[PDB]
Amino acid sequence: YWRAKSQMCEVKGWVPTHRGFPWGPELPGDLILSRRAYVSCDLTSCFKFFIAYGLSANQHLLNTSMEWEESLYKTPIGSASTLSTSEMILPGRSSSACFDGLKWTVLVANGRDRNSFIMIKYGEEVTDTFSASRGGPLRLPNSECICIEGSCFVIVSDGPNVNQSVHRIYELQNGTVQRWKQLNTTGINFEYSTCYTINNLIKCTGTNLWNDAKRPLLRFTKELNYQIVEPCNGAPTDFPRGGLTTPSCKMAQEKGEGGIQGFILDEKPAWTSKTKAESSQNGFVLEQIPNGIESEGTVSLSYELFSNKRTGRSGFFQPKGDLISGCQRICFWLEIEDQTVGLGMIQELSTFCGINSPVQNINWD
Amino acid sequence: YWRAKSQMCEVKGWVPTHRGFPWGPELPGDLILSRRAYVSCDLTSCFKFFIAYGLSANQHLLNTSMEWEESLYKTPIGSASTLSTSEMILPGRSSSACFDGLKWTVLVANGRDRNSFIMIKYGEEVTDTFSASRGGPLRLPNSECICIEGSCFVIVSDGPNVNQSVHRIYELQNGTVQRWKQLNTTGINFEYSTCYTINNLIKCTGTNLWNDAKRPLLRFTKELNYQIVEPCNGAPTDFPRGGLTTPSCKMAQEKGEGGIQGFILDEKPAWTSKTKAESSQNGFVLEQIPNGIESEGTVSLSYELFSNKRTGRSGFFQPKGDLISGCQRICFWLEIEDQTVGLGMIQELSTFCGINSPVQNINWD
Amino acid sequence: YWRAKSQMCEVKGWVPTHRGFPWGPELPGDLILSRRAYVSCDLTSCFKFFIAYGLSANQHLLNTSMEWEESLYKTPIGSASTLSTSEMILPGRSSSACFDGLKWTVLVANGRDRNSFIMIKYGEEVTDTFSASRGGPLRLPNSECICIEGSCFVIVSDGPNVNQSVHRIYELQNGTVQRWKQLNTTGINFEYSTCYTINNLIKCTGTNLWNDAKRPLLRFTKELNYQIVEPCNGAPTDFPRGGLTTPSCKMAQEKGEGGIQGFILDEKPAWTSKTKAESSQNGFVLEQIPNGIESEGTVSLSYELFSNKRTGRSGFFQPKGDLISGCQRICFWLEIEDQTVGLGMIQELSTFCGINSPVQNINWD
Amino acid sequence: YWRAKSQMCEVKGWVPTHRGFPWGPELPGDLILSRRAYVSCDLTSCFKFFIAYGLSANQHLLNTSMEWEESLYKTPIGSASTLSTSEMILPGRSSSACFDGLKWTVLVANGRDRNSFIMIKYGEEVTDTFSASRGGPLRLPNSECICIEGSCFVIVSDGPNVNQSVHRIYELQNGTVQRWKQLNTTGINFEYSTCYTINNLIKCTGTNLWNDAKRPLLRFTKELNYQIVEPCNGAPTDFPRGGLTTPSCKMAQEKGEGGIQGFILDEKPAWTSKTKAESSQNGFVLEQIPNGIESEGTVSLSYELFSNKRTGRSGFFQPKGDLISGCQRICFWLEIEDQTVGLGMIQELSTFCGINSPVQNINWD
Ligand SMILES: *[C@@H]1O[C@H](CO[C@H]2O[C@@H](C)[C@@H](O)[C@@H](O)[C@@H]2O)[C@@H](O[C@@H]2O[C@H](CO)[C@@H](O)[C@H](O)[C@H]2NC(C)=O)[C@H](O)[C@H]1NC(C)=O
Ligand SMILES: *[C@@H]1O[C@H](CO[C@@H]2O[C@@H](C)[C@@H](O)[C@@H](O)[C@@H]2O)[C@@H](O)[C@H](O)[C@H]1NC(C)=O
Ligand SMILES: *[C@@H]1O[C@H](CO)[C@@H](O)[C@H](O)[C@H]1NC(C)=O
Ligand SMILES: *[C@@H]1O[C@H](CO)[C@@H](O)[C@H](O)[C@H]1NC(C)=O
Ligand SMILES: *[C@@H]1O[C@H](CO)[C@@H](O)[C@H](O)[C@H]1NC(C)=O
Ligand SMILES: [Ca+2]
Numbered sequence A, B, C, D: 001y002w003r004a005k006s007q008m009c010e011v012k013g014w015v016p017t018h019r020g021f022p023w024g025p026e027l028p029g030d031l032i033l034s035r036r037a038y039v040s041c042d043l044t045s046c047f048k049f050f051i052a053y054g055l056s057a058n059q060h061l062l063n064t065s066m067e068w069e070e071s072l073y074k075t076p077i078g079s080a081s082t083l084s085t086s087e088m089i090l091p092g093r094s095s096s097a098c099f100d101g102l103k104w105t106v107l108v109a110n111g112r113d114r115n116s117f118i119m120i121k122y123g124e125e126v127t128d129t130f131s132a133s134r135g136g137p138l139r140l141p142n143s144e145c146i147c148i149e150g151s152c153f154v155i156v157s158d159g160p161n162v163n164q165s166v167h168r169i170y171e172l173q174n175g176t177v178q179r180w181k182q183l184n185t186t187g188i189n190f191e192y193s194t195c196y197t198i199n200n201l202i203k204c205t206g207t208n209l210w211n212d213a214k215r216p217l218l219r220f221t222k223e224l225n226y227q228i229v230e231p232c233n234g235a236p237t238d239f240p241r242g243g244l245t246t247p248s249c250k251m252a253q254e255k256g257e258g259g260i261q262g263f264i265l266d267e268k269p270a271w272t273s274k275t276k277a278e279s280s281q282n283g284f285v286l287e288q289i290p291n292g293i294e295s296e297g298t299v300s301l302s303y304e305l306f307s308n309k310r311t312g313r314s315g316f317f318q319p320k321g322d323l324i325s326g327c328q329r330i331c332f333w334l335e336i337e338d339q340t341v342g343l344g345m346i347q348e349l350s351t352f353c354g355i356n357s358p359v360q361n362i363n364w365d
């Protein structure tokens, strides 16, 4: 029964733990094509979880992209996702996974419309199911769920419309629903939750696909007492987004429609993340805000990890081990396009971890 | 030495535990082409057992189908069957496998006509063999055999014609025949047995390729006391089959010739399974019958798991693990054709398990 | 420290433990091309050892023959030999391997002419070497060596001509030469030795590439005391060979030139093995000779395991486990050509094991 | 906490432990293209560490060479480097790795110019980083670092010019820098360090890319007492290089510019190694010098391992196991070009180990 360590490690920079090489114009045939990938770790190692939809042998024979028969797979971090290296878990359209210290809890959502429902698996057996309450498709955040002392927490979205979506925090134990809390999210939309835990608190960053280019933030406790916070920055981090504005706790309404999964490290000094410019989905920059993200958006540190690389989803994951540090590490994963492979068929899932040491502002392009 | 749990779990729905993604028009070269696949589990995991006949590199260069040199292979469930993931067991045309709690018992049948015989393997070494007694080829049901308290049970078929076939129960211990019992099957044919065990009883659903579109049923004990039963329904579940009829315990003679391996769960409420319509081998529907299958056929629940998918063989398997449930779960596997792969070269072996919860009538096409 | 059991199992039949399926006209690219393969087992599992010379991707681009940079590899029996499944051991032109109960002893011979020498590897490390003493290339038998109580035995051949070859028994312990004894093989030639042990005795079948169509026999003890025996049969088993003649302890001179690796199970009763007819290298027949091989060759049992399949090298291996038998099992491996693959690039290494029961004369084509 | 044993084994010859077969004109698609490979072993086995830049599927579609996004990978020695067999460690341009008895210490350098820095990883987690001190890029030697009693040592090079490079010994513990020592290397250049240890002495051979065709030598202790030595030979071993000269301890300045990673075994008899001739990068010859390398270059033994084979980088590795010798074995790795594969896309990483027995002067072409 894993607990996050006593304190957050001081973060002064981010270094990549996983970053591969170009898989070239032509691919081998046994690679699995994926989307909505994320990272989750057990006590020894970390894993890629992804929604598989095709084989690389059909690189040029498949629609881009395909909303057909999709299935959740897992692959050891460090290994390429192939038919010989990857393991099927469940059929699914979106998913979440987490390790409690004993077993893996895996959630998948299947179906669109009212027939949509969620399956929960706990170490090799399906343990629980529940159906949609609000008509629309049930949606999992495609990110690590969070486990504390045998209790796992995950946010499920429901509702057919972005202008009337509902969102719930579910508490699970052994793959069984114990209880949930429906959130008052009126006025906003909270999709693609990516979360992390610190000192028995869970902090999640959301994505507003409706009316905001700023990212809504969620903080809650084991008793599901919650608070939703809006960044008091003037710098939107969603994509798409508008330009800089005067700092205020007002939502960023310009180009609020749309969005992509992304993260905000809501701590004592805060870390923000976004594409380099709002005109294009290229590059990735991390910026430190000492007074927190509920302050004015005053940047002390700015790292440009990528300049030209086409960038996509990003989210948190926490390594559950660290036999060397007495502090709780924080890491994030990030989709980067292998431009040597046409049509965005290959989004590498890169990973970065925070370090207590400052680092060069190196470009990883 | 595995023992079955006290009672069957209450089943209100079926959820897929295995369901993959389209393998596209073109396949990679190292995939193994298979037939007669089924599922069997040990204490930790489940495995696909199949008769291998070719490689995917020769997808368009092979006779279809090839009843040449065929060989029994095994693959961890969740992994694709490739030359690097699949493992040779024995040469064979049909097979059965079961795990007793200590070692695997594997049976294979080889040869046609009078030279036909069966090899029995028990944990890495071949321990016993026996020959055809009735001239024709020895035939195994291509499904999990049943092990109880160190004793494993399997049904063996013999005879060159379906209109005078013979069927026997063999009892094994440490891969050696302890004794056998020939069943009185006059008037019927009982091929492709798929079985499960509960409270010292083994129940098998058979397939009549001769004169019945209903599925004959078998119940027996460790002492080889048996009873053969005909469904008193009016709704045939075999393929091919005729239309709905007036309920009776009489066989359905309309389109009785031919058949496909299939299952009937005869418990306190019973579960029946079949293609959606008799006109085509498409779809798959599960129907619940509260009064048992020897009653009149009154349906309470009807789940249409597939509508358009081309459907094939189905049969039982029981997971021998389940650390969350104290009752005996039941699962089935089902061949579903990957329509993106031409000529039915790919039958995915999907799996469904029963749950105590009611679930949506979702289409898994 | 593994020891062979007290007694030989009574053998009345042979059953295939390994026999695969056609790999078709076209192969996937990652298969390793091999020759001089054989089988050897540890306490748990068995392995294929082979001399690798190429990749299947160059199936149609490689010369016959290419006697070039060759390397000894190993692959778990039950797996195809591929780049992801096979493991390099040592560079080598011929080899021998045996497991002592703790570690593997592996021998390879490299070089032609006088620069030829042998490397001995004992669990990941090279432990001893010795060079050619008699001018010609050093040759290992390409079959399992034999270990008894930590002492391992292998026959090494030397000399550039078959009419003046020399042969020595080397006794090794911990991968180091303890002693060797040169055999008086004057008048004959003793290549391609395949051996098995029973009751502290080692029995080997040789191949005469010079002047005999019969297979010479060797029997020796841990103390390197030996006896060389000629079959008193009238039925030669080498290939090529002449027709049947009157039984005598005389060599079979017709077509004595040339030969192929093969085995004779010399016990009481003895088993002989050979091609179906002397005109062609198709098929394989096992014949039982009750009074031993030093008698006249009166056959009681005759099995035609293959009829049309092209047959090649064959030799012994002993499974070192068997927790079901108190007797020593005996098995043989056999090259069978996959005729679906052109130019004999694929020699499937099938394996047969002896059983205490008589079995049907089934054709395994 | 592994320590190398008391004294070096007497070395009279070198035998290949790894030497493969031609991978032919055409390669399969899933092979990883590599550069800067070296070998390092744990308690059980040895591993290939390399810088990956591409896939073999793009054999004819890739530039030679590719200075793009490079990543450090590892593969079990004996296995081919494939997407299914190789594992990503860290992104990197050059690297070093060593095993302390518990965990792997891995260092990689990224960036050119002033942004260059090094990451240190200790068992699955990043533990330390440090940046350039001298403007130019940080460089690791692309060879095994050295661990003694929990202390690991590696040479880090810096400076944008060969005519004023700096080199430091770093001491690491648990993936953490304890201290570092800058060497006085004024007048020379010390790149591509390959090192080995004996009884608390570390001996490294360097490569001078600036003004020397002899290889600079380094000797140091756990407490960083060090000495830089020049061979008093008359035979330069670097490539490129000029011809033989009169023995002296002065640098060989003819063709001193440039160089290639190479090794010198400085022991009580010394061993030198180099290409066959200075005219071309073909062949490899090992020469023994009884009075040590600070003596006159008097050769007693000369082995020509290769004549025609194109040869590249070479360096040391030590097996940390070996239960047959009570003495410390020494091994080296050697890049050899697979000439059946065009454009030197395949550099096989061959390995040789020293032995106390004399061996034939056999050519491994
Ligand atoms: C549901 O939410 C609305 C508006 O959105 C809220 O979302 C959260 C981030 C929360 O912390 C809150 O600060 C934020 O405004 C709530 O409306 C607020 O309160 C009153 C309600 O009459 C109104 O003035 C506005 O809608 C808004 N406040 C301000 C200052 O404008 C609303 O109260 C809440 N409903 C419930 C269930 O209490
Ligand atoms: C540093 O060294 C300079 C030359 O010393 C020689 O060259 C180096 C590379 C080593 O091989 C060393 O053993 C040689 O003796 C000196 O000229 C210089 O004064 C030295 N500087 C200091 C501060 O000691
Ligand atoms: C066997 O079964 C048939 C039909 O079920 C039945 O009529 C007959 O009595 C049985 N035969 C014997 C010998 O009991
Ligand atoms: C690949 O790289 C360059 C372009 O960067 C290309 O012009 C050339 O053909 C290839 N390599 C070189 C530098 O020769
Ligand atoms: C290095 O790490 C170990 C634990 O891995 C611990 O003893 C301490 O942190 C250091 N110990 C030594 C002996 O170097
Ligand atoms: Ca938005």
Ligand SMILES: [Ca+2]
Pocket (backbone or CB within 6 Å): B207, B208, B209, B210, B211, B212, B213, B214, B238, B239, B240, B255, B256, B257, B258, B259
């Ligand atoms: Ca029928």
Ligand SMILES: [Ca+2]
Pocket (backbone or CB within 6 Å): C207, C208, C209, C210, C211, C212, C213, C214, C238, C239, C240, C255, C256, C257, C258, C259, C260
């Ligand atoms: Ca012969």
Ligand SMILES: [Ca+2]
Pocket (backbone or CB within 6 Å): D207, D208, D209, D210, D211, D212, D213, D214, D238, D239, D240, D255, D256, D257, D258, D259, D260
């Ligand atoms: Ca130089």
